[PDB]
Amino acid sequence: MDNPNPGPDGEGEVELEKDSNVVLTTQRDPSTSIPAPVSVKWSRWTSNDVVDDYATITSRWYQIAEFVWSKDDPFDKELARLILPRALLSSIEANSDAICDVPNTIPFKVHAYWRGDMEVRVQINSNKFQVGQLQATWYYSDHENLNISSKRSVYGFSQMDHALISASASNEAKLVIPFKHVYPFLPTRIVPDWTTGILDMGALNIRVIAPLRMSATGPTTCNVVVFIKLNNSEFTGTSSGKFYASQIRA
Amino acid sequence: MDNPNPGPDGEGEVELEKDSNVVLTTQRDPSTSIPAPVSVKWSRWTSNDVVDDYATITSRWYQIAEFVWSKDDPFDKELARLILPRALLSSIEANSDAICDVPNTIPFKVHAYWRGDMEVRVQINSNKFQVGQLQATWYYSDHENLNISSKRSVYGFSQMDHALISASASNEAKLVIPFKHVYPFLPTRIVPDWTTGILDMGALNIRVIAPLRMSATGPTTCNVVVFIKLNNSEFTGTSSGKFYASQIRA
Amino acid sequence: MDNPNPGPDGEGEVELEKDSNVVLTTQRDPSTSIPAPVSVKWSRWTSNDVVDDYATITSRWYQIAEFVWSKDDPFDKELARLILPRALLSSIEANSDAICDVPNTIPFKVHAYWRGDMEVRVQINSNKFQVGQLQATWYYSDHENLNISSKRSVYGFSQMDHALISASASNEAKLVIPFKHVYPFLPTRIVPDWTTGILDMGALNIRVIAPLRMSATGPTTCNVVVFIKLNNSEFTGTSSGKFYASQIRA
Amino acid sequence: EESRNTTVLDTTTTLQSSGFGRAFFGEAFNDLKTLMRRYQLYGQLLLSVTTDKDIDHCMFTFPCLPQGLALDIGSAGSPHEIFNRCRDGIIPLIASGYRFYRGDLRYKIVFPSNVNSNIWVQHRPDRRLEGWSAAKIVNCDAVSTGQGVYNHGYASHIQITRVNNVIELEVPFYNATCYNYLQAFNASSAASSYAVSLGEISVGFQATSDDIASIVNKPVTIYYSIGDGMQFSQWVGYQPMMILDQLPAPVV
Amino acid sequence: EESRNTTVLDTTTTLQSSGFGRAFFGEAFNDLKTLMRRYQLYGQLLLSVTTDKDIDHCMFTFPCLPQGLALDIGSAGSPHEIFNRCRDGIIPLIASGYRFYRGDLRYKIVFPSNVNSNIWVQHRPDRRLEGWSAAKIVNCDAVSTGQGVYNHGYASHIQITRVNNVIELEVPFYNATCYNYLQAFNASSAASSYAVSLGEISVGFQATSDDIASIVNKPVTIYYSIGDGMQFSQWVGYQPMMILDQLPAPVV
Amino acid sequence: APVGVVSSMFMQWRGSLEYRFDIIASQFHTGRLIVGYVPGLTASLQLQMDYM
Task: Delimit the domains of chain C by residue range.
Answer: 1-250
Using an 8 Å CB-CB cutoff, list chain F residues near A6. Answer: 27
| Among candidate residues B187, B214, B217, B216, the one with its CA nearest the CA of residue B201 | B187
Half-sphere exposure of B196 (CA within 13 A, CB side): 2
User: Cα(B64)–Cα(B89) distance, rounded to whole angstroms?
Assistant: 8
- The CA-atom distances, in angstroms, between C33 and each of A72, C26, C122, C163 are 50, 16, 12, 5
**Residues present in chain F in total:** 52
Going by C-beta distance under 8 Å and a sequence separation of 6 or more, which residues neighbour residue E4? A8, A9
Residues paired with residue E105 on neighbouring β-strands, in sequence order: E171
**By the 8 A CB rule, do E79 and E245 touch?**
no
Sheet holding B234-236, edge to edge: B186-187, B113-115, B234-236
**By the 8 A CB rule, do A4 and C6 touch?**
no
User: Cα(E82)–Cα(D56) distance, rounded to whole angstroms?
Assistant: 111
Q: Which chains touch F (3 or more CB pairs under 8 A)?
A: A, C, E
Helix (H, G, I), strand (E, B) or coil at F35: coil
Look up the domain containing D1 and give its range.
1-252
Residue B248 CB coordination number (10 Å): 14
| Among candidate residues A58, A207, A66, A190, the one with its CA nearest the CA of residue A118 | A58
User: Cα(F34)–Cα(D183) distance, rounded to whole angstroms?
Assistant: 42
Q: Which of residues 10-49 of B touch D (CB under 8 A)?
A: 10, 14, 16, 18, 21-23, 25
| Among candidate residues D123, D205, D118, D202, the one with its CA nearest the CA of residue D164 | D118
- The CA-atom distances, in angstroms, between A157 and each of A203, E36, F2 are 12, 71, 56
Q: Both ends of chain E: CA-CA distance in Å?
A: 51
Strands (E), chain C: 63-67, 113-115, 118-124, 131-140, 163-166, 176-177, 186-187, 202-205, 208-213, 224-229, 234-236
**By the 8 A CB rule, do A164 and A133 touch?**
yes
- The CA-atom distances, in angstroms, between B172 and each of B121, B226, E141 are 7, 10, 92
Amino acid identity at C188: T
Instruction: Identify the DSSP state of D219.
Output: B
Residues paired with residue A229 on neighbouring β-strands, in sequence order: A119
User: Cα(A75)–Cα(E224) distance, rounded to whole angstroms?
Assistant: 79
User: Cα(F50)–Cα(F52) distance, rounded to whole angstroms?
Assistant: 5
Q: Report CB contact under 8 Å: A129, F32.
A: no
Residue of C1, C29, C129, C217 for testing the chain B interface, max B β-carbons within 10 Å: C1
Q: Which residue of C has its CA nearest to B28?
A: C5
- The CA-atom distances, in angstroms, between D222 and each of D45, D106, D150, D160, D227 are 9, 10, 20, 17, 15
User: Cα(A50)–Cα(A64) distance, rounded to whole angstroms?
Assistant: 29
User: Cα(C152)–Cα(C157) distance, rounded to whole angstroms?
Assistant: 7
Residues paired with residue B136 on neighbouring β-strands, in sequence order: B163
Angle at C233 between CA C228 and CA C236, to 5 degrees: 130
Q: Which residue of B has its CA nearest to A32?
A: B7
Strands (E), C88-230: 113-115, 118-124, 131-140, 163-166, 176-177, 186-187, 202-205, 208-213, 224-229
Instruction: Identify the DSSP state of B101.
Output: G
Angle at B130 between CA B161 and CA A216, to 5 degrees: 160
Q: Given phi > 0 = left and psi -120 to 50 = alpha, else beta, which region is D187?
A: left
User: Cα(D7)–Cα(B9) distance, rounded to whole angstroms?
Assistant: 9
Using an 8 Å CB-CB cutoff, list chain B residues near A12. Answer: 2-5
Residues paired with residue A131 on neighbouring β-strands, in sequence order: A213
Angle at E74 between CA E76 and CA E199, to 5 degrees: 160
Breaks in chain F, named by the residue before each, with C–N above 2.5 Å? Answer: none
Amino acid identity at E244: L
**By the 8 A CB rule, do D186 and D132 touch?**
yes
Chain A interface includes E252 (CB < 8 A):
no
Domain count, chain D: 1
Residues paired with residue A10 on neighbouring β-strands, in sequence order: A7
Amino acid identity at C205: N
Dihedral of the CA atoms D98, D104, D107, D108 (nearest 10)?
Answer: -140
User: Cα(D128)–Cα(D143) distance, rounded to whole angstroms?
Assistant: 19
**By the 8 A CB rule, do C240 and C78 touch?**
no
Q: Report CB contact under 8 Å: C148, E195.
A: no
**By the 8 A CB rule, do A186 and A200 touch?**
yes
Q: Which residue of C has its CA nearest to E1?
A: C163
Going by C-beta distance under 8 Å and a sequence separation of 6 or more, which residues neighbour residue D64? D105, D107, D123, D171, D197, D198, D199, D200, D201, D224
Amino acid identity at A191: V
Dihedral of the CA atoms A39, A44, A48, A50 (nearest 10)?
Answer: 50
Chain E interface includes A5 (CB < 8 A):
no
User: Cα(D114)–Cα(D196) distance, rounded to whole angstroms?
Assistant: 35
| Among candidate residues A5, A243, B103, E86, the one with its CA nearest the CA of residue C30 | A5
| Among candidate residues A179, A40, A181, the one with its CA nearest the CA of residue D189 | A181
Half-sphere exposure of D232 (CA within 13 A, CB side): 23
**Residues present in chain E in total:** 252
**By the 8 A CB rule, do B234 and B59 touch?**
no
Of C1, C2, C7, the CB nearest to B166: C7
User: Cα(E147)–Cα(E129) distance, rounded to whole angstroms?
Assistant: 13
Method: cryo-EM
**By the 8 A CB rule, do C84 and C228 touch?**
yes
Chain A interface includes E7 (CB < 8 A):
yes
**By the 8 A CB rule, do E107 and E168 touch?**
yes
Instruction: Identify the DSSP state of F29.
Output: -
**By the 8 A CB rule, do E149 and E58 touch?**
yes
HEC secondary structure over chain A: CCCCCCECCECCCCECCCCCCCCCCECCCCCCCCCCCCCCCCCCCCCCCCECCCHHHHCCCCEEEEECCCCCCCCCCCCCCCECHHHHHHHHHHCCCCHHHCCCCHHHHHCCEEECCEEEEEEECCCCCCEEEEEEEEEECHHHCCCHHHHCCHHHHCCCCCEEEECCCCCCECCEECCCCCCCCEECCCCCCCCCCCCCCEEEECCEEEEEECCCCCCCCCCEEEEEECCCCEEECCCCHHHCCCCCCC
Helix (H, G, I), strand (E, B) or coil at B186: strand
Q: Count H helices, E strands: chain C? A: 5, 11
Q: Which of residues 183-242 of E touch C (CB under 8 A)?
A: 183-192, 195, 233-240
User: Cα(C119)–Cα(C175) distance, rounded to whole angstroms?
Assistant: 6
Going by C-beta distance under 8 Å and a sequence separation of 6 or more, which residues neighbour residue D40? D89, D90, D91, D92, D223, D224, D225
Instruction: Identify the DSSP state of D60.
Output: E
Strands (E), chain B: 63-67, 113-115, 118-124, 131-140, 163-166, 176-177, 186-187, 202-205, 208-213, 224-229, 234-236
User: Cα(A165)–Cα(A120) distance, rounded to whole angstroms?
Assistant: 13
User: Cα(E218)–Cα(E207) distance, rounded to whole angstroms?
Assistant: 14
User: Cα(D179)–Cα(A179) distance, rounded to whole angstroms?
Assistant: 13
| Among candidate residues B68, B88, B245, B91, the one with its CA nearest the CA of residue B177 | B88
Helix (H, G, I), strand (E, B) or coil at D106: strand
Residue D189 CB coordination number (10 Å): 22
Backbone angles phi, psi at A155, to 5 degrees: -65, -30
Q: What DSSP line would sit under E81-150, residue for residue?
A: HHHHHS-S-SHHHHHTTBSEE---BB---B--SS----EEEE--TTPPP-SSTT-S-B---S--SGGGB-
Of F9, F18, F20, the CB nearest to E90: F9
Of E4, E6, E10, the CB nearest to A23: E10
- The CA-atom distances, in angstroms, between B179 and each of B36, B104, D85, D148 are 8, 18, 67, 94
Going by C-beta distance under 8 Å and a sequence separation of 6 or more, which residues neighbour residue E125? E154, E174, E175, E198, E199, E200
**By the 8 A CB rule, do C86 and C135 touch?**
no
Angle at D167 between CA D165 and CA D170, to 5 degrees: 170
**Residues present in chain D in total:** 252
- The CA-atom distances, in angstroms, between E113 and each of A188, C237, D144 are 83, 57, 119
Q: What DSSP line would sit under D125-146, residue for residue?
A: TTPPP-SSTT-S-B---S--SG
Angle at C63 between CA C59 and CA C66, to 5 degrees: 155
Helix (H, G, I), strand (E, B) or coil at D92: helix
Residues paired with residue A176 on neighbouring β-strands, in sequence order: A119
User: Cα(D107)–Cα(D220) distance, rounded to whole angstroms?
Assistant: 12
Nearest Cα of chain A lies from the Cα of D127 at a distance, in angstroms, of 14
Q: Report CB contact under 8 Å: E188, C156.
A: no
User: Cα(A146)–Cα(A136) distance, rounded to whole angstroms?
Assistant: 21
* CB neighbour class for D104 (10 Å; exposed up to 12, middle 13-18, buried from 19): middle
Q: Report CB contact under 8 Å: B21, D11.
A: yes
| Among candidate residues D237, D132, D150, the one with its CA nearest the CA of residue D186 | D132
